[PDB]
């Protein structure tokens with residue numbers, strides 16, 4: 243009854259299953275058109291699982307912000323598996339874009355990307371939402387180069403499966419090199435642990451998509467961080483911005499900035515650059 247505003251109609255969605263764009267563990271992503279909106283469509287067994295899927299769809303549908311990727315709707319089909327419909331992001335993920343050599347953002351542009359992610363995250367935080375996997379690969383770019391925080395809720399997956407590693411006991415693939423210390427220990431995530439991930443994302447931006455800790459093995463990162471060791475300041479990263487990243491990696495989660503504070507500080511840095 244209350245899901246009607248989330249559910250997409252009978253002949254209102256056209257999906258192109260021949261042309262694929264994404265490969266998540268929980269499903270593949272295709273091109274689509276929604277009546278005219280260009281979409282990305284992810285295809286995802288029983289009534290209890292469907293109902294859960296609907297319920298969280300209603301919850302996620304009311305997340306609205308220019309720096310957060312929106313859910314356009316859902317299209318459950320009696321014959322097939324449910325389809326999650328999202329707006330098509332012309333310039334793909336933020337990591338591949340800043341690695342794409344045919345493009346050439348400035349340092350200023352790269353700082354403006356980080357400012358936008360902080361705004362998107364500032365919004366998510368205010369709704370008590372914890373992302374759990376904030377990273378350049380999960381932030382998308384539209385035709386205007388507006389950055390949209392993404393890969394949370396219904397379309398939550400691991401698409402680039404290279405940067406996810408299994409903790410043996412729990413049996414869950416985690417992005418350890420984007421994870422706060424206390425999250426590696428306790429396996430528990432908070433908005434303050436998103437702030438950690440945001441510091442890493444900034445490092446990604448300033449290095450133009452370089453992988454974090456290439457010389458530290460996935461099973462050594464906890465010890466590495468325990469020892470006080472942190473990512474180096476990138477060559478073209480301004481000092482005040484490195485000071486910001488270091489505050490994000492504070493051993494105590496309590497002492498890390500908020501996303502509100504970060505929007506304020508990066509916007510100051512952006513304005514003087």
Ligand SMILES: C[C@@H](Oc1c(N)ncc2c(-c3cnn(C4CCNCC4)c3)coc12)c1c(Cl)ccc(F)c1Cl
Pocket residue numbers: 263264265266271282284311328329330331332333334335379380381382392393397401
């Ligand atoms: C679920 C899926 O959503 C997408 C959304 N919402 N928008 C665009 C894409 C593309 C994609 C794949 N290629 N391109 C462009 C990149 C620039 N050259 C033309 C093609 C875009 C792949 O996936 C897209 C996705 C994927 Cl696969 C990975 C990370 C994400 F955050 C999201 Cl949100």
